[PDB]
Design an enzyme around this catalytic site. Structure first.
Site, PDB file in Angstrom:
ATOM      1  CG  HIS A 122      -0.313   0.032   2.506  1.00 56.42           C
ATOM      2  ND1 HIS A 122       0.332  -1.032   3.045  1.00 56.42           N
ATOM      3  CD2 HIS A 122      -0.054   1.068   3.332  1.00 56.42           C
ATOM      4  CE1 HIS A 122       0.795  -0.726   4.235  1.00 56.42           C
ATOM      5  NE2 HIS A 122       0.647   0.558   4.406  1.00 56.42           N
ATOM      6  CG  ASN A 123      -0.775   4.488   0.756  1.00 61.22           C
ATOM      7  OD1 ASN A 123      -1.384   3.736   1.489  1.00 61.22           O
ATOM      8  ND2 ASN A 123      -1.372   5.405   0.005  1.00 61.22           N
TER       9      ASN A 123
END
Ligand code: MG
Lengths: 341, 341, 341
Positions: free
Chosen positions: B240-241
């Site tokens: 994620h991210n």
């Protein structure tokens, strides 16, 4: 039309005290530096406290402590991070399927699907399988013979369960996961590998998460065992007859060899490997890309590998490592020589 | 009937000058040592120059330099490797689907599929999804709610996009890739992990390649970001991210932890790991199976690990590493002792 | 009704001599410590000999040696482990599909499926593909153009073969495997990666096993080659133009870079990586998570990495590794200084 809640509705959900106007509408969540006036933020890490007074957030989840002197609207809670964790679900836009079985799903006559379950397009549910209440089976899932999914389970599209996989309540399984496959089980006859049939199953507890493209092998004789509350990230490999204790977390790309036993409340960082037939006790943390070669009987953190260096410097360190036996012998000769003079 | 081109047709495609007969028919490409008379070869690496005069190739892509003194037919180009790269596509036998939607594909009424797109058998296209011109969606693909694929995209069979995945033009995604899954996002409450909903999406740029069984997690709040021209090999895990700058390449089995930022024109060799919340600047090369534990602010190559040795020699080096604190203390005592005499 | 055999039927299958009553019914297999009276056990490892006299097993596979003095029913064999391996298949509850093509399977008019083969629900068999006698193709398999599967092959649900994949007899492929995908093949033009079409195929020998979510890339020009009897565990990555010799085994999460050549009867432990364009000779063992950076010309075991330590101790060892060039220089100065006095 976008999801929207008042600060009052959000505060009610986490038991917060609103210090400001409860009627402010909120359209999402954001970190302190990204947040705009239609978003709720949070301060969890003392390192981000710098960014609190300048944040454009409409409101911030704060401890009583961090709310003193703060000019904006605070939602005051014991634990801002846990309150964020709870509120995140109110802004999730993941589609939810209605109860029912898609006309293209294939369900064996002696499979049982709870009428509150959803079964997506081109799913295959085999003989004797049991799908519990409120379970969501995504498109293209395959649920093998006699396998069980407990109430409130969620399977993304394209999850594969082999036969004789038993799952507890509230599972969450991301796409591409393979549960109950046949692991490397071979006997060597004068250089030729002979297959050992893998005739155990898998038992998974309640509130387990399994990430994308993770594989969990069936047992050779008894089951591979995953305890309650175990959280597994993506691209993990769990070999035959592994046992994972309750509330253990494993980050992505972890590989656990056959018959390893991991205790409760352990945390394996990304790319960790465990050799077979070892045991790790409770409350063990293993740092990234460590190779665990033996049983761990003391709680705490464990590591292997070397520090990253610029390649030219690394090459010098690696050359010196190969000389360490020679250097140790030379240091011993020098001590003996100095002692003698 | 097999694909066939004249040396003249091939030379026209890459702007080569044919030194010999342009009418020679060519049925494929081969390396200098494998090539027969119906195949075009190339000399890229000065190490393979030994094999040029003995090659049975019908013709060879060469620099003006390597064409001087050469007895065969040369196709003279600035860059033989790039010319090979361009010509390879003319001999690709991968099937190409005609425009249209397979009768078994399921397309939401409010999904938009360009009429020049192809959608394979048992594909599922969800509500609000957008499939651009000249896009090829393979059999058994699942394209989540509101996800977008730009013109000229190619998805192998069995690619999964979750909801809110936005892809630019000319993507290439191999089978088993999972884009937009929920990554490991948990808050710890006295040993019990509490799920954090992952309510960001994924933004992928133009001319991105994603290999087989690669996973790219959605963002927790904002999007996971993949820049233009990024090339990802097989069995990669992007958490994620993560942010990946333009023109970065990552070899197979790479794992990038949450919120890491990689600059432009980086190259991560196979099995590299990055910890979370670090930044790598532009023009960084990380060698195979390195663990990157901190931000890199200087361009160049970086490494971790040890040299491979025969196991018995390795075991001696590993034992000496554990003694290094003792050896350093002994070396210090010896210096003090010699100084004193 | 459960699978059941007499000790006499089991003994006939492995050529054992029953020392006791051949009529005892057996319902399964178990290890010496887990076994109850309806189960057959085995003693393979001298370490487990402690547990033989106390085992509740109905009978035990034993060498003539271990049967002398034993009070229970022995099934006497040369090799108890190999006999267990053979008998395991008699207690396998994996479902077996009847011959035929599921009505929802899509089979190209110019594909050939042997009438003794089984093709599962929502399988796709492309133009020119050949499915041999006694082959089992699971639900949702995709078999690309011109690909071949030899007699007695078994594909789990959700296996993907690209075009021009040739497989020998008696393959076993677990779910999620991707065979013949396009590997990382790019030419760099002043920082911009240019795709090289991957126009070779894959050739797989007889009696090969491929585990769950394993990827095997097609060749760039010639084929990727997997020999006979090769056993590949889960989450393996085999890059373009790799060659794997007969009877080699690779444990899970192994990654082999492009054009590497591995000899016969090799064993790569879990998480091993090989760089590209190297050769490993026959009878090489590489221990877990080793990075193999060069060709191996001598049979035996090879290792890289460091010993696992408690994190605080590891951090001290890693700091000393970075100082080794300085320590070597200091040791040299000390030797010169002592020599001089
Ligand atoms: Mg790995």
């Amino acid at each position: 039309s976008t999801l929207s809640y008042t600060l009052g509705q959000l505060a009610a959900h986490v038991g917060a005290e609103v210090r400001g106007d409860a009627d402010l509408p909120i359209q999402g969540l954001a970190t302190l530096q990204e947040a705009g006036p239609a978003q709720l933020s949070f301060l969890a890490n003392p390192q981000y406290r710098k960014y609190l007074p300048e944040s454009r957030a409409g409101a911030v989840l704060l401890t009583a402590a961090d709310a003193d002197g703060f000019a904006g609207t605070a939602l005051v809670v014991a634990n801002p991070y846990l309150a964020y964790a709870s509120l995140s679900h109110l802004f999730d836009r993941k589609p939810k399927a209605a109860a029912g079985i898609h006309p293209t799903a294939i369900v064996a006559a002696d499979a049982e699907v709870d009428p509150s379950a959803s079964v997506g397009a081109y799913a295959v549910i085999e003989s004797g399988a049991r799908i519990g209440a409120g379970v969501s089976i995504g498109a293209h899932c395959v649920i093998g013979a006699r396998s069980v999914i407990g109430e409130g389970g969620w399977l993304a599209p394209r999850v594969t369960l082999y036969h004789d996989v038993t799952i507890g309540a509230r599972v969450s399984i991301q796409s591409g996961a393979v549960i109950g496959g046949e692991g490397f089980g071979f006997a060597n006859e004068k250089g030729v590998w002979q297959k050992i049939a893998q005739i155990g199953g898998v038992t998974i507890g309640d509130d387990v998460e399994i990430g994308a493209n993770t594989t969990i092998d069936r047992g050779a004789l008894s089951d591979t065992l995953i305890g309650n509350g175990v959280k597994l990230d993506n691209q993990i490999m769990i070999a035959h007859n592994v046992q994972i204790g309750d509330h253990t977390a494993m980050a992505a790309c972890v590989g656990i060899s056959g018959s390893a036993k991991i205790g409760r409340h352990c945390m394996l960082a990304g790319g960790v490997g465990l050799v077979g037939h070892i045991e790790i006790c409770d409350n063990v943390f293993v740092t990234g890309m460590t190779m665990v070669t033996r049983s761990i009987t003391e709680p705490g953190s464990y590591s292997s590998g070397t520090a990253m260096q610029p390649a030219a410097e690394w090459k010098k360190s690696a050359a010196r490592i190969r000389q360490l036996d020679d250097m140790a012998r030379r240091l011993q000769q020098l001590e003996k020589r100095l002692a003698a003079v």
